[PDB]
Amino acid sequence: EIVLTQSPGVLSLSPGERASLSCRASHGLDTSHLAWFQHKPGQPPRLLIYGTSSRPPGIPDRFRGSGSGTDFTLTITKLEPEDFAVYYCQNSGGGTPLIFGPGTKVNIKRTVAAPSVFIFPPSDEQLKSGTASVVCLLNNFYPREAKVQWKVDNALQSGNSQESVTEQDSKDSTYSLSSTLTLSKADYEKHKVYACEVTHQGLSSPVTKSFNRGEC
């Protein structure tokens, strides 16, 4: 089975800059059998390059494909706003299965921004349901990588939280993230301190936001 690797994992660049994307194969490929695709979330993949270096009709010539053997490159000569997307190389034939590489995401570069962190207790209304949701909001930060830890009366929580992250903001190029801790009402009422500890490179040290159950 062919294995494809893509580097960088992510690229962070400004509109107007050149992008160089790497695709390496575990065994040599015919140039006829290496393709590149663009993908944006929720939209069909788009063929950029086939046969290592050929553009299908309609593809702008700022997209250039090169390479041979085990080493392939997709160049974007000058990034346009629409080019911030995920790019996949693909072993496109002539046998099967056809393999997509792991992808390189090209993000909009901006300065590092620490998250503003907010914590929300469950509403009294929800507690009537028998379940308590505690929400931790990490707002307007960059880059996307962030760590959230939950502690309840200083016990680290495991398996009872879920995270969601926004796409890069159109105006300020930041991300936001939510982490939601789910507890039974019974467990929520048995404990006092609810803490969300956040680690991000914009912070000199991790930040903890907390509340005590029952306090205004």
Added chain:
Amino acid sequence: QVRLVQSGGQVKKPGASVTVSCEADGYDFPDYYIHWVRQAPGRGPEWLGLIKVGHGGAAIYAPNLRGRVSMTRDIHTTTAYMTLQRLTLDDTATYYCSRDNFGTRPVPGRGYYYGMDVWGQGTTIIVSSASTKGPSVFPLAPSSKSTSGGTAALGCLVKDYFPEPVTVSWNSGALTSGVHTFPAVLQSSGLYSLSSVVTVPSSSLGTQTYICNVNHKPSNTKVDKRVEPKSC
């Protein structure tokens, strides 16, 4: 008007079967193979198989789904199909068809090339035991634990609905600055949940009303939830 048009999205029970169609328009159907590809939440695209349209119509399948997938074409109706049986939760994904010369024909100026150049719009298949259910919308109230000096955060927790999607606005669309509506998560219960938040000036909490407008068309549920500061 070269295009591939797929059938609509479907919710299916675990163990059921589903057939997705892919109708070809605007080109000579027998001149291109058809592939099926899917992309599941949080994963990259996965090739599932191809149909040898124009070369006898046999299918080749990827090993992961082999034994419970069937792919066929109908030359007369220029349509291709994928049928996936014994559906599991892990089959929840968007399914795409694509056309491809796949090295079969001598395209003038391009040769016996390989390249999936035209794609269908996608078909979302949700595999779930859940019944249609509207959300319970809870306030994420602004407090001191959600205030950054002159800024406060507030929101709505839109919990326990099925299937996707909900839409959320604030103050009937009049409030857009600082709004973040998060992608939904699938809970262990099988129901979806999301939050929508907004940052506003702390000083505005006593004078400006904040209402999240939530619409869940699948269950004919509409919610307009007022979010007010914590009672002190």
